């Protein structure tokens, strides 16, 4: 089964009259790899549904066929694949050599053929240069120089309107790589959800890259409690789509660890890399009390009595009683919760934090509170109607 | 967000157009709103119905004529120069493939975001037979905006 | 005999609003309807007319503008 | 001689992705507008030419029936060469366009530019075939494809649509390459000639 | 000679659109003065 050797060759001879102006090097390079299964930039038609990470031999060949690719199949093969797919080849010898192709060559095409949208559909003439602006400083030199180029891409995100979401996700991909190696992973976890949450057409990756992306999603929520908790990614097709071993279960074990409240149980199943950072242990205690903080409205008591004892959250968060006053104090400083506390009576009252998507016994009690609203219609409401 | 203020003359004339066309439950009426969308409060100072044809059993069947829009817009220039197309309204409670695809058709003649309006011809429940809805993307997401009824001095009198 | 005009709530608000711009300024419009003499009289829908150099006059009626409206007012069945 | 309405349908599919046979493509469809309109409206009155798009970018109406072919050319602007293909929508838009128009009680004809074999559903093509016969609608399918595309649901729609003689359809195959598109359409029964009823 | 005739037909009708647009404006500005 040869996709690029035969299917790509036969279908190329059928379209664009007879051949797309094939040079003698075209058929010579197809016989180079033979059964080694090296597709190497399948060149439009096949390349849409077929990806190749091997080092292309034809990189300097199809460059003269770009004008033929437009009249053959589609112009999206250049912007969504081919020269834009060079990042999948993982060729270090081409580093910062693509400015003459992925930038300067596309700049000359934008000043001649396509002025704004060109012809056919949209998505061409914008994502060409805009994708590689921030991708220039991702590798090699530090990400500090890339931050100045991220704001220019965010301004064109809301201004430009495109039907496919691959252009929008291409802007958040550079934002994720910026906060990946830096601190403040709350922004990394925020840009990762907007990059991919559930999108079928956009962000098409193999099975091996889904677990690698899930690894970045795992380490994103370790250092911060924002946007729900580790259990938020469980409802999304993330944890259910990955294997439960090889340290990919970190997001699953921390969900049940909130109710158990023991760090030693989770520390025994992990390595020294993630267990040496105290930020993981500190920000995990905020989520453990958070479950008890959501009990202030209705959980057990049916009378809606709001009271919080420091002894109940002590065993839940694995923290002593004297450090409870400083635990809730850091929550207000970071803007996690709003409210007032009382040290004399040991009572805590909060307005709200981020009420979760949880269901079952929660939605059952939610209906009971609305019954009291309807009970006044049968009690206080019917008396005013008789007046 | 933004605000929407609809005059009572717009909603009064929009309901009778449903009767003038003798539209049954199998079809719905679509029309265009005119006003000033530049400010934060969207106001509709004019409206007119369009001969919109639709099949209820098939969401892929709709008929919208753009030729009547170009002629009507040129006729309003000799009436009121301050009136421009701020969007389009429609009837029926349901939002289907007919109303979602035509939202971008009026966008060509509308500078700002076209204001979506669900008009209840039967006036079922509470107040506000017509609700103010704005189109925004994250799938088409229609967010509700506050709808207030305010008219001129001599209009209310 | 004479004719008794019966303006509904739709026509009264539209004919009024068209002439609410300015004290000195004068405008004009066109009324349409279907009725019979011998008392009864109705008005379906109205629309304003463009102002010429003479303002309100007999020559201010544009047969070109009036013919284009009656074709645009036919879509909803209000053409009379 | 022939009093009928003409609706140009712009349909695209995967087979339309080729943009250059000699030089470019789809500009012959632009030039063919003045040949079809002048041979109908300018030749005899009560013959109007419309334009719609049932495939490609959006299933909308590009231009309604006008008094000149230039307004039809304005609708041809901003048209995606590659896009989705819906046959039932293209026939439905033209049927609703031919339903509401001027010069009523006349013959109705649909001229569709077809680059594809049109494989969607068998019952959907038959249901629309029996409905258009009551309104006296003639759907003219002009084959583009690669050379000739036949023995598919395209011919099944033509075979089952014909109860009468001249009121149904005519087949025209366009040879790819440096060929004249307006000449094959002019000599075809699509323009005047056969189809009068 | 069949090349420039494609773009010439477009500019020919675009001039008529601007002509018919100002034709109603020329008669309107004279009535407004």
Curated annotation (Swiss-Prot), chain B:
Residues 4-138 form the MPN domain. N-acetylated by NAT1. Present with 19800 molecules/cell in log phase SD medium. Belongs to the peptidase M67A family. Acts as a regulatory subunit of the 26S proteasome which is involved in the ATP-dependent degradation of ubiquitinated proteins. This is 26S proteasome regulatory subunit RPN8. The gene is RPN8. The chain holds residues 5 to 169 of 338 of the full protein.
Swiss-Prot record, chain C:
Disulfide bonds: none annotated. N-acetylated by NAT3. Transmembrane segments: none annotated. Component of the lid subcomplex of the 26S proteasome, a multiprotein complex involved in the ATP-dependent degradation of ubiquitinated proteins. RPN11 is the only catalytically active member of the lid and serves as the essential deubiquitinase of the proteasome. Belongs to the peptidase M67A family. Present with 16400 molecules/cell in log phase SD medium. Component of the lid subcomplex of the 19S proteasome regulatory particle complex (also named PA700 complex). The 26S proteasome consists of a 20S proteasome core and two 19S regulatory subunits. Interacts directly with RPN8 and STS1. The JAMM motif is required for the deubiquitination and degradation of ubiquitinated substrates. This is Ubiquitin carboxyl-terminal hydrolase RPN11. The chain holds residues 23 to 102 of 306 of the full protein.
Swiss-Prot record, chain D:
GO terms for cellular component: cytosol; nucleus; proteasome complex; proteasome regulatory particle, base subcomplex. Multiubiquitin binding protein. Disruption phenotype: Cells are viable. The keyword Ubl conjugation applies. The 26S proteasome is composed of a core protease, known as the 20S proteasome, capped at one or both ends by the 19S regulatory complex (RC). The RC is composed of at least 18 different subunits in two subcomplexes, the base and the lid, which form the portions proximal and distal to the 20S proteolytic core, respectively. Belongs to the proteasome subunit S5A family. Ubiquitinated, leading to its degradation. Ubiquitination is promoted by HUL5. This is 26S proteasome regulatory subunit RPN10. GO terms for biological process: proteasome assembly; proteasome-mediated ubiquitin-dependent protein catabolic process; ubiquitin-dependent protein catabolic process. The chain holds residues 1 to 197 of 268 of the full protein. The keyword Ubl conjugation applies. Residues 5-190 form the VWFA domain. Present with 17200 molecules/cell in log phase SD medium. Keywords: Proteasome, Ubl conjugation. GO terms for molecular function: K48-linked polyubiquitin modification-dependent protein binding; polyubiquitin modification-dependent protein binding. It comes from the Eukaryota.
Curated annotation (Swiss-Prot), chain E:
It is found in: Cytoplasm; Nucleus. Signal peptide: none annotated. This is 26S proteasome regulatory subunit 6A. Belongs to the AAA ATPase family. N-acetylated by NAT1. It comes from Saccharomyces cerevisiae (strain ATCC 204508 / S288c) (Baker's yeast). The lineage of its organism: Eukaryota, Fungi, Dikarya, Ascomycota, Saccharomycotina. Disulfide bonds: none annotated. The 26S proteasome is involved in the ATP-dependent degradation of ubiquitinated proteins. The regulatory (or ATPase) complex confers ATP dependency and substrate specificity to the 26S complex.
């Amino acid at each position: 089964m040869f996709n690029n050797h035969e299917i790509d060759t036969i279908l190329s001879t059928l379209r664009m009259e007879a051949d797309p102006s094939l040079h003698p090097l075209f058929e010579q390079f197809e016989k180079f790899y033979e059964e080694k299964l090296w597709f190497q930039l399948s060149e439009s038609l096949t390349k849409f549904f077929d990806d190749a990470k091997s080092t292309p031999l034809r990189l300097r060949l199809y460059d003269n066929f770009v004008s033929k690719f437009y009249d053959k199949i589609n112009q999206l093969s250049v912007v969504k694949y081919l020269l834009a797919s060079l990042k999948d080849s993982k060729d270090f010898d081409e580093s910062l050599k693509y400015l003459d192709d992925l930038k300067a060559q596309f700049q000359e095409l934008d000043s001649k053929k396509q002025r704004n949208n060109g012809s056919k559909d949209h998505g061409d003439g914008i994502l060409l240069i805009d994708s590689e602006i921030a991708r220039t400083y991702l590798l090699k030199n530090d990400l500090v120089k890339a931050r100045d180029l991220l704001d220019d891409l965010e301004k064109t995100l809301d201004k430009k309107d495109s039907i496919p979401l691959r252009i929008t996700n291409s802007f958040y991909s550079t934002n994720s790589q910026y906060f990946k190696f830096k601190n403040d992973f709350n922004s990394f976890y925020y840009t990762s959800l907007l990059y991919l949450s559930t999108l079928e057409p956009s962000t098409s990756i193999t099975l091996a890259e889904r677990q690698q992306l899930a690894y970045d999603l795992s380490i994103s929520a370790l250092l911060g409690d924002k946007i729900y908790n580790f259990g938020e990614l469980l409802h999304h097709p993330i944890m259910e789509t990955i294997v439960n071993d090889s340290n990919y279960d970190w997001l699953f074990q921390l969900l049940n660890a909130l109710t158990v409240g023991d760090f030693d149980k989770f520390d025994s199943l992990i390595k020294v890399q993630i267990s040496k950072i105290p930020i993981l242990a500190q920000h995990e205690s905020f989520l453990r009390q958070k479950i008890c903080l959501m009990t202030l409205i209705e959980t057990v008591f049916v009378k809606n009595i709001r009271m919080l004892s420091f002894e109940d959250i002590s065993k839940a968060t694995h923290l002593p009683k004297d450090n409870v006053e400083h635990l809730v104090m850091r929550a207000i400083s970071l803007g996690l919760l709003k409210g007032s506390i009382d040290q004399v009576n040991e009572l805590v009252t909060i307005s709200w934090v981020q009420p979760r998507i949880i269901s079952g016994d929660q939605i059952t009690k939610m209906k009971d509170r609305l019954v009291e609203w309807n009970d006044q219609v049968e009690k206080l409401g019917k008396k005013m109607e008789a007046r | 967000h933004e605000k929407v203020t609809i005059a009572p003359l717009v909603l009064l004339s929009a309901l009778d157009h449903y009767e003038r066309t003798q539209t049954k439950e199998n079809k719905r009426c679509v029309g265009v709103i005119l006003g000033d969308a530049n400010s934060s409060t969207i106001r509709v100072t004019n409206s007119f119905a369009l001969p919109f044809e639709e099949d209820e059993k098939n969401s892929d069947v709709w008929f919208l004529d753009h030729n009547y829009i170009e002629n009507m817009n040129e006729m309003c220039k000799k009436i009121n120069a301050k009136e421009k197309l701020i969007g389009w309204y429609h009837s029926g409670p349901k939002l289907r493939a007919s109303d979602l695809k035509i939202n971008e058709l009026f966008k060509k003649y509308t500078q700002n975001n076209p204001l979506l309006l669900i008009v209840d011809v039967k006036q079922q429940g509470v107040g506000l037979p017509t609700d103010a809805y704005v189109a925004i993307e994250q799938e088409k997401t229609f967010l509700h905006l506050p709808c207030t009824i305010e008219a001129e001095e001599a209009e209310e009198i | 005999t004479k004719e008794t005009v019966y303006i509904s709530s739709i026509a009264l608000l539209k004919m009024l609003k068209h002439g609410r711009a300015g004290v000195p300024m004068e405008v004009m419009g066109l009324m349409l309807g279907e009725f019979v003499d011998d008392y009864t009289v109705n008005v379906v829908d109205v629309f304003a007319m463009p102002q010429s150099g003479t303002g309100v006059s007999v020559e201010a009626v544009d047969d070109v503008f009036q013919a284009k409206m009656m074709d645009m007012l036919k879509q909803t069945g209000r053409d009379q | 001689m022939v009093l009928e309405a003409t609706v140009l349908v712009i349909d695209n599919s995967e087979y339309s992705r080729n943009g250059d046979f000699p030089r470019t493509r789809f500009e012959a469809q632009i030039d063919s507008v003045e040949f079809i309109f002048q041979a109908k409206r300018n030749s005899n009155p009560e013959n109007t030419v419309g334009l719609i798009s049932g495939a490609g970018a959006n299933p909308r109406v590009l231009s309604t029936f006008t008094a000149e072919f230039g307004k039809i050319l304005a609708g041809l602007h901003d048209t995606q060469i590659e896009g989705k293909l819906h046959m039932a929508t293209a026939l439905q838009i033209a049927q609703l366009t031919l339903k509401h128009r001027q010069n009523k009680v006349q013959h109705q004809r649909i001229v569709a530019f077809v680059c594809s074999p049109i494989s969607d559903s068998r019952d959907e093509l038959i249901r629309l075939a029996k409905t258009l016969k009551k309104n006296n609608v003639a759907v003219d399918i002009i084959n583009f494809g690669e050379i000739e595309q036949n023995t598919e649901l395209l011919d099944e729609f033509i075979a089952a649509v014909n109860n009468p003689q001249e009121e149904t359809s005519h087949l025209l195959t366009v040879t790819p390459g440096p060929r004249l598109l307006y000449e094959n359409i002019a000599s075809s029964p699509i323009i005047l000639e056969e189809g009068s009823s | 000679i069949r090349i420039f005739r494609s773009e010439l037909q477009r500019l020919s009708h675009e001039n008529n659109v601007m002509l018919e647009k100002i034709k109603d404006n020329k008669e309107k500005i004279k009535n407004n003065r």
